[PDB]
Write an enzyme that holds these catalytic residues in place. Structure first.
Site, PDB file in Angstrom:
ATOM      1  N   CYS A   1      35.225   9.040 -21.637  1.00 31.04           N
ATOM      2  CA  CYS A   1      34.018   9.728 -21.182  1.00 31.04           C
ATOM      3  C   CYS A   1      33.244   8.913 -20.174  1.00 31.04           C
ATOM      4  O   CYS A   1      32.604   9.474 -19.297  1.00 31.04           O
ATOM      5  CB  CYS A   1      33.099  10.092 -22.358  1.00 31.04           C
ATOM      6  SG  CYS A   1      33.893  10.946 -23.726  1.00 31.04           S
TER       7      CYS A   1
ATOM      8  N   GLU B   1      26.810  14.439 -26.781  1.00 32.81           N
ATOM      9  CA  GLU B   1      27.451  13.478 -25.892  1.00 32.81           C
ATOM     10  C   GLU B   1      28.511  14.192 -25.092  1.00 32.81           C
ATOM     11  O   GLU B   1      29.633  14.402 -25.556  1.00 32.81           O
ATOM     12  CB  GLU B   1      28.096  12.363 -26.688  1.00 32.81           C
ATOM     13  CG  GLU B   1      27.131  11.637 -27.626  1.00 32.81           C
ATOM     14  CD  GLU B   1      26.392  10.496 -26.968  1.00 32.81           C
ATOM     15  OE1 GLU B   1      26.752  10.100 -25.840  1.00 32.81           O
ATOM     16  OE2 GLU B   1      25.441   9.982 -27.595  1.00 32.81           O
TER      17      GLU B   1
HETATM   18  C1  LIG Z   1      34.331  -3.771 -24.346  1.00 32.52           C
HETATM   19  C2  LIG Z   1      35.800  -3.974 -24.080  1.00 32.52           C
HETATM   20  O1  LIG Z   1      36.191  -5.026 -23.607  1.00 32.52           O
HETATM   21  N1  LIG Z   1      36.703  -3.013 -24.344  1.00 32.52           N
HETATM   22  C3  LIG Z   1      36.522  -1.722 -24.887  1.00 32.52           C
HETATM   23  C4  LIG Z   1      37.636  -0.900 -25.012  1.00 32.52           C
HETATM   24  C5  LIG Z   1      37.509   0.385 -25.542  1.00 32.52           C
HETATM   25  C6  LIG Z   1      36.270   0.872 -25.955  1.00 32.52           C
HETATM   26  N2  LIG Z   1      36.167   2.104 -26.504  1.00 32.52           N
HETATM   27  C7  LIG Z   1      35.617   3.234 -25.990  1.00 32.52           C
HETATM   28  C8  LIG Z   1      35.554   3.500 -24.624  1.00 32.52           C
HETATM   29  C9  LIG Z   1      34.999   4.700 -24.180  1.00 32.52           C
HETATM   30  C10 LIG Z   1      34.504   5.642 -25.087  1.00 32.52           C
HETATM   31  S1  LIG Z   1      33.876   7.030 -24.620  1.00 32.52           S
HETATM   32  C11 LIG Z   1      32.606   7.492 -25.597  1.00 32.52           C
HETATM   33  O2  LIG Z   1      33.444   6.944 -23.255  1.00 32.52           O
HETATM   34  O3  LIG Z   1      34.933   7.996 -24.720  1.00 32.52           O
HETATM   35  C12 LIG Z   1      34.581   5.375 -26.441  1.00 32.52           C
HETATM   36  C13 LIG Z   1      35.133   4.183 -26.883  1.00 32.52           C
HETATM   37  N3  LIG Z   1      35.175   3.968 -28.259  1.00 32.52           N
HETATM   38  O4  LIG Z   1      34.131   4.048 -28.904  1.00 32.52           O
HETATM   39  O5  LIG Z   1      36.244   3.710 -28.795  1.00 32.52           O
HETATM   40  C14 LIG Z   1      35.157   0.051 -25.843  1.00 32.52           C
HETATM   41  C15 LIG Z   1      35.287  -1.232 -25.305  1.00 32.52           C
END
Ligand SMILES: CC(=O)Nc1ccc(Nc2ccc(S(C)(=O)=O)cc2[N+](=O)[O-])cc1
Ligand SMILES: CC(=O)Nc1ccc(Nc2ccc(S(C)(=O)=O)cc2[N+](=O)[O-])cc1
Lengths: 446, 446
Positions: free
Chosen positions: A243, A209
């Site tokens: 990311c 990833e």
């Molecule tokens: C869906 C929503 O409202 N909020 C929300 C907020 C934060 C995340 N987290 C989130 C966001 C991006 C990534 S990544 C892989 O692009 O770096 C990973 C996570 N994660 O797994 O923690 C996921 C969703």
């Protein structure tokens, strides 16, 4: 020889057959669930120290997605692990044809620093569910989380099966000499090649990833109020260190300034007039990354923000206008709270712009027109796609999350995690009876 | 230099979007179908010259499986290529959630020599169906087939999109410096590491169909008449040169001699008293491999055959008894008409024997007791499994064919070929309206 001991002990524990019954795995998973509940405040403390997260976003932007994954996997495990019967043929009527799922063995998860809990533990949930021993290597940049996990993981989970390895590049390099059955790595494109090179020596399958610059195309006749609020949210959470953050915007020069404006308006709602005074706004991880991000703001037309404080590693939400595609800020993954706007004069030009660059982890577009959405999808390539929102597409258990080309290979989340961390073994079982119909295959031929 | 041109021309042809419509892909596949029909006798000629196949087994032991694959893919393509809707959640009701299938780009298929048509063209069928440009590199050891394919492929298929590359190790090595989107390689474990090392430099995903020693466990209370017939068939076809040939037998010492006997009986039915006079019996590919195979017969208890002729590269069907697990013939993939019998005194000991070695491409067992079958499967790991038969498990469109560990990574055949040669892209499409349920995510937080 501590690294080798931990791996050897993990392999031996897997060989004993301990992980095979579903009961055992479900219980480890239930142990993780208790960890998350009993250590909630310690986890928040670690995330606050590393990334200036507060108690709310520590949970609702990171930790809660591990819980949902655990709950979902516990629930679906018996169904996923069950032998899967497949389509027969007119000649295999009497036969049993099925796919058998089995663990790979010892799995290595190498975590990263921007979401140091989630991007270490979510892949682990999958690997545990699939019945593997799982070796963990947290990122050293998230120093507080790395040190905490090394303490609490062994308190809750089996000691031999799920060891935590401390250290940095030298330790990691040495871990990669050990024989693993699968490796999952989240981080940078450059290091992905190293992981893969190391994997080749034992023919170890990999899930990578990686990164890139996730474009965000904004269409002319769409409601920019809703669009810019969503963009600003996904762009500036975790101080831009995501990311799948929308890395840059592509739009017609006629709507640029309205976008800039509606972004400011949304930013002010989120973090107030001064973002440095908001408990909801994050900080850059390290000194080295703070300077990298600042150096990208130079020689650029700033429309907002632009300033930073080296001591606390704060960078104000920055928007750049009329950005040159060849300038530094458009030649690397930003991974910070700096949003460049690049002008394109048609959908077709935006498509071409995206296709001439390496394939991104995410692709975003905002439009009322279904045909514009469908066209950009059909004519580009990316890990995943979200139309009219950002980030959310990687939080749904039915949508596998992963890259393509430079943004990565393989995927996980939900059932995909189970599949990724298993071997799917094709089985044919025939009755052992003298079948006269199979006699045509045997020599001599007519 | 002309290797670079072929790849560049293939990339440019893919970039033009020519392969995207299903019509075009079906057309290329229908052209392959035509090739197989119009060149049937030339194909037989090539296989006869390389491996001493006759006209019957050239078709029924190789070519017919390409045809079936083509027919199946043409038929199922629109269904496979269609966007795949996935499970929603209570929060994504208004949304579209689907998986979008798209080509990877330029695919490399590196063929091997034992089935020089099938193991070059069958992977190609998949990669074509998935909408890729496909570069071919046939094995030089199958000199006649390699040279024929270079002539006939461009006569039937698009010239830019599907180039054939001639040569050996030096040419192959140079081809691996070029940038591909996927690599499929069939061959040896050792070279697999090289392929993967070369692939890492461009982060190219790989499918590796490798080797090992496929065990064949024979149970005490089963009908040995049927068992040994099937074993001898799979073991001695193509003069033992088959990746999923039962490489050796494991059995209780009490049934050894009966097995030896029933094998002879079956062998005599297949190839007569002297196998050298049978047009159904094959020859070893090269001088180097003829000697390798002969050297494995040395210092061994021969129970049948044992002799060979260097001129025509013939080796008589050989059965070895009371074989030492440590002897050369049990320390490498045989890939020849030499069948060692190793004694084990229980099912549990057979299982342990298998598990202490590298994971094989296939695992075979013969038994009336389903509980014995189920146990050996549950307690071993292999690419695929057949109970009470050999070979046949890799000819069914619904059972993916591939290895695990040293026997390989990834898989193909049927729908799996399509998946392997595509990127499966996760798509989320939301309406661009207001959503008050989404408001909770935005800062400031509680
Ligand atoms: C869906 C929503 O409202 N909020 C929300 C907020 C934060 C995340 N987290 C989130 C966001 C991006 C990534 S990544 C892989 O692009 O770096 C990973 C996570 N994660 O797994 O923690 C996921 C969703
Ligand atoms: C199904 C049956 O009765 N006979 C039968 C006979 C020959 C084959 N062919 C066959 C057998 C093995 C292999 S491999 C990959 O292990 O080397 C490849 C092919 N091949 O070229 O397709 C497949 C089936």
């Amino acid at each position: 020889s501590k690294i080798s001991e931990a791996v050897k002990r993990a392999r031996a524990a897997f060989s004993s057959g301990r992980t095979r019954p579903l009961q055992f795995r479900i219980q480890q998973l239930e142990a993780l669930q208790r960890l998350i509940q009993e250590q909630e405040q310690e986890l928040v403390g670690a995330l606050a120290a590393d990334l200036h997260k507060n108690e709310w976003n520590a949970y609702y932007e990171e930790v809660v997605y591990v819980l949902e994954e655990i709950e979902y996997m516990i629930q679906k495990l018996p169904e996923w692990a069950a032998d899967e019967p497949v389509e027969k043929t007119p000649q295999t009527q009497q036969d049993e044809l099925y796919i058998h799922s089995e663990p790979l063995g010892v799995v290595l998860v190498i975590g990263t620093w921007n979401y140091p809990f989630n991007l270490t533990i979510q892949p682990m949930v999958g690997a545990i569910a699939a019945g593997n021993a799982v070796v963990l290597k947290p990122s050293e940049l998230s120093e507080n989380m790395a040190s905490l996990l090394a303490t609490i993981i062994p308190q809750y989970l089996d000691k031999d099966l799920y060891p935590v390895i401390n250290g940095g590049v030298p330790e990691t390099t040495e871990l990669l000499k050990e024989r693993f059955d699968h490796i999952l790595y989240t981080g940078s494109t450059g290091v992905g090649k190293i992981i893969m090179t190391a994997a080749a020596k034992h023919l170890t399958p990999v899930t990578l990833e990686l990164g890139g610059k996730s474009p965000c195309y904004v269409d002319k006749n769409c409601d920019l109020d809703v669009a810019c609020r969503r963009i600003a949210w996904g762009k500036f959470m975790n101080s831009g260190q995501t990311c799948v953050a929308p890395d840059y915007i592509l739009c017609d020069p006629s709507i640029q300034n309205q976008i800039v404006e509606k972004l400011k308006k949304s930013l002010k709602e989120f973090y107030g007039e001064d973002a440095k005074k908001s408990r909801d706004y994050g900080r850059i991880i390290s000194a080295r990354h703070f300077q990298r991000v600042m150096g990208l703001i130079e020689g650029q037309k700033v429309a907002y923000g632009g300033t930073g404080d080296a001591a606390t590693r704060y960078i104000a939400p920055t928007i750049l206008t009329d950005v040159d595609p060849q300038s530094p800020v458009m030649q690397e993954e930003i991974f910070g709270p700096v949003l460049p706007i690049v002008c394109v004069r048609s959908l077709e030009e935006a498509i071409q712009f995206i296709n001439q660059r390496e394939k991104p982890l995410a692709l975003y577009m905002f439009s009322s027109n279904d045909k514009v959405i469908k066209k950009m999808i059909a004519e580009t390539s990316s890990g995943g796609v979200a139309a009219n929102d950002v980030i959310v597409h990687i939080t749904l258990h039915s949508l596998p999350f992963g890259g393509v080309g430079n943004s990565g290979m393989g995927s996980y989340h939900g059932k995909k995690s189970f599949e990724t961390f298993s071997h799917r073994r094709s089985c044919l079982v025939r009755p052992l009876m003298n079948d006269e119909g199979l006699k045509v295959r045997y020599p001599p031929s007519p």
